[PDB]
Amino acid sequence: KGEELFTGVVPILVELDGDVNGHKFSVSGEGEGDATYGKLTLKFISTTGKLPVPWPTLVTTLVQCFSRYPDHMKQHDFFKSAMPEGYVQERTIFFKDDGNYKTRAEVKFEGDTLVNRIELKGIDFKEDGNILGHKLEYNYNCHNVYIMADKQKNGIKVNFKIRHNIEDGSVQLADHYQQNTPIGDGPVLLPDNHYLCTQSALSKDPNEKRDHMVLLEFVTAAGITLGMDELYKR
Ligand SMILES: [Ca+2]
Numbered sequence: 246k247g248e249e250l251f252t253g254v255v256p257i258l259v260e261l262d263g264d265v266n267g268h269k270f271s272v273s274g275e276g277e278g279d280a281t282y283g284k285l286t287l288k289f290i291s292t293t294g295k296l297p298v299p300w301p302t303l304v305t306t307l308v309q310c311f312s313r314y315p316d317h318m319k320q321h322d323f324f325k326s327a328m329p330e331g332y333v334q335e336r337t338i339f340f341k342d343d344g345n346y347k348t349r350a351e352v353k354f355e356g357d358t359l360v361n362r363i364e365l366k367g368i369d370f371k372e373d374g375n376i377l378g379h380k381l382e383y384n385y386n387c388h389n390v391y392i393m394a395d396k397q398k399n400g401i402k403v404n405f406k407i408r409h410n411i412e413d414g415s416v417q418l419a420d421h422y423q424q425n426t427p428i429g430d431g432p433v434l435l436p437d438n439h440y441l442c443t444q445s446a447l448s449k450d451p452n453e454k455r456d457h458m459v460l461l462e463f464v465t466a467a468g469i470t471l472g473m474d475e476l477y478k479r
Pocket of ligand 1: 379
C-alpha cells in the first residue's frame with residue numbers, strides 16, 4: 246500500500262545537521278521525486294558558511310524510496326513498503342586512507358511531503374586529505390547499490406562503493422555500509438538480493454549566491470531475473 250503514495254510527483258524536504266572533525270554545518274534541501282521514472286530533482290544549500298567538506302561526499306547521505314522498481318520486482322521494494330511511517334537509515338562511510346562518516350536518518354512522510362532528516366558525524370579526516378583539502382571534482386559517477394534482506398531487524402542491509410573523481414586524475418573511494426529498519430509496526434517487504442543502478446548529475450544555479458548543490462538523479466532497480474512468461478509475453 247505504501248507504493249500507492251509514489252504514483253506521481255512527491256515533494257521532498259531534506260534536513261542535515263553535521264559535524265566533521267569538529268566543523269559544524271547544516272544543509273537544507275527541497276525538490277521533488279517521481280518514482281515512475283526513478284527521478285529526483287533537488288537543490289541543497291549550506292546554511293552556515295562554505296561547506297567544510299566537498300558537496301559530492303554528501304550526495305549519498307542527502308531517499309531511495311524514489312527508485313524505479315520494474316513491475317516484476319515490485320514485491321522487493323522495501324523502501325516504499327515502509328511508507329508512510331517510514332524507515333531509519335543508518336550508514337558508516339569509510340573514505341579510503343581518510344576519515345569516516347556515521348549517519349542516522351529518518352525518512353518518512355510529513356503530510357504530503359517526503360522528509361529525510363539526518364544527523365552526520367565525521368571523524369579522523371586528514372587536514373590535507375581529499376575531503377578537508379577540497380580536492381574532489383564537482384561531479385558524480387554511476388554506481389551499483391546492493392540490497393539484501395536482514396530478517397533479524399525486519400529490514401535491509403545495503404553495501405556499495407562510491408567513486409569520487411579527484412582533481413589530479415585519481416579517484417577517492419568511499420565504502421558505504423548501510424542498514425534500514427522500519428519505523429512502524431506494519432508489514433514490510435523483505436527483498437531477495439538485488440541492486441539499484443544509479444546516475445547523478447551535479448550542477449550550479451547562477452542566481453544562488455550561497456554555497457549550494459543542484460542534483461538530478463535517476464535510479465532503477467535490477468538483479469531479479471524476468472520469468473520466461475514475462476520475457477516472451479505478447
Ligand atoms: Ca571548492
